[PDB]
């Protein structure tokens, strides 16, 4: 009941933030850096905003003239979900070079972070990135649940196989 309203607020905020352009560095001769990362020019940074579904689930969106950082607090109901989520996010971050919009590490306080730059919005349809982020949030919850059901299902079969042989 609170899912759709949450994702809708996040999607709209992402459209507002993903309005980037190429920006040569102002501080370093012939450099080109994601301003939201280096933050060496305050006027190039936008106001950080947060969209929260509850005390646990939320999304932090940090914009700047040429890049946006997106951090997500994934839902983790119990311990098995917590460790599965951590292993899954770690798994994807290790492959960040292939998943080119992912940060190698989340922003402190979040489980996974994206760094979308102007080069990305230049090479991909920005409305499709927004779609991807929303799609991502929904799909990780689903995968985590399936993983949870799997570990439980295999555990039952493993306990029986051993017990039934005595």
């Amino acid at each position: 009941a609170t899912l759709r309203p949450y994702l809708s607020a996040v999607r709209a905020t992402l459209q507002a933030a993903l309005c980037l352009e190429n920006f040569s560095s102002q501080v370093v001769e012939r450099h080109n850096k994601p301003e939201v990362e280096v933050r060496s020019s305050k006027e190039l940074l936008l106001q950080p905003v947060t969209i929260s579904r509850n005390e646990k689930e939320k999304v932090l969106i940090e914009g700047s003239i040429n890049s946006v950082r997106v951090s997500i607090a994934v839902k983790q109901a119990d311990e098995i979900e917590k460790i599965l989520c951590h292993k899954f996010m770690r798994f994807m971050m290790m492959r960040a070079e292939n998943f080119f919009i992912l940060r190698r590490k989340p922003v402190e306080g979040y489980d996974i972070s994206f760094l979308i730059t102007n080069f990305h919005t230049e090479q991909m349809y920005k409305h499709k990135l927004v779609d991807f982020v929303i799609h991502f949030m929904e799909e990780i919850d689903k995968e985590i649940s399936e993983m949870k059901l799997s570990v439980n299902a295999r555990a039952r079969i493993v306990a029986e196989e051993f017990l039934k042989n005595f």
């Binding site: 370093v28 012939r30 450099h31 990362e37 760094l115």
Partner: protein, 204 residues
């Protein structure tokens, strides 16, 4: 001469050596002139070691040229190393693809700014002494306390190893730092009056 200069300091770095040649309204000053045993070949050599710790083992003789070409195309000077490291460890924006001669493609990231840092931190490649900036600084401070300001606002880069994007900016920041600590003893108050414009000619 080109810039219409008679007096200033030329920082020159080529494939074999780095010299800091001060010049006053006419000719050089062999007494102030200094040398840095770190240049083009050295950076290229260091890149080779860095790429090795990355899983790409290039032979020092067989591939020297290839790694040199990678250096010229992807390497640059870091302005704030602490900030560059964070970009390398936390993101992938620094990663660029580079096709080797045999067709294989490799990925180069943090090493892009790490190899040239040798110019500012010789120890990185087991060389003694201070870095190019600190050396430049000392050379100027060890000169006529009347012609100093003239020098500072007239530093000119020359040579292939001085084309690294960000170099001019790094020098300036480093000098400003050296001044704030060794000439103003922490007096940030009067740093704003310090003039340093390192000329970066479009014909280096």
């Amino acid at each position: 001469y080109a810039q219409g200069l008679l007096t200033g300091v030329v920082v020159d770095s080529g494939d074999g050596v780095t010299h800091i040649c001060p010049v006053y309204e006419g000719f050089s000053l062999p007494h102030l002139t200094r040398r840095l045993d770190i240049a083009g070949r050295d950076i290229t050599r260091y890149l080779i070691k860095l790429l090795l710790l990355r899983g790409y083992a290039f032979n020092h003789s067989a591939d020297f040229e290839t790694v040199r070409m990678i250096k010229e195309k992807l390497c640059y000077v870091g302005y704030n190393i602490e900030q560059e490291q964070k970009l390398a460890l936390e993101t992938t924006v620094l990663v660029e693809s580079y096709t080797l001669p045999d067709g294989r493609i490799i990925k180069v990231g943090g090493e892009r700014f790490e190899a040239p840092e040798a110019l500012f931190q010789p120890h990185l490649i087991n060389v003694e002494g201070v870095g190019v900036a600190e050396l430049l600084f000392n050379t100027i401070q060890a000169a006529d306390i009347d012609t100093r300001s003239e020098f500072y606002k007239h530093i000119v880069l020359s040579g292939g190893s001085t084309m690294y994007p960000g170099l001019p900016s790094r020098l300036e920041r480093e000098l400003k730092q050296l001044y704030l600590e060794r000439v103003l003893k922490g007096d940030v108050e009067k740093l704003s009056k310090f003039k340093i414009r390192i000329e970066d000619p479009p014909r280096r």
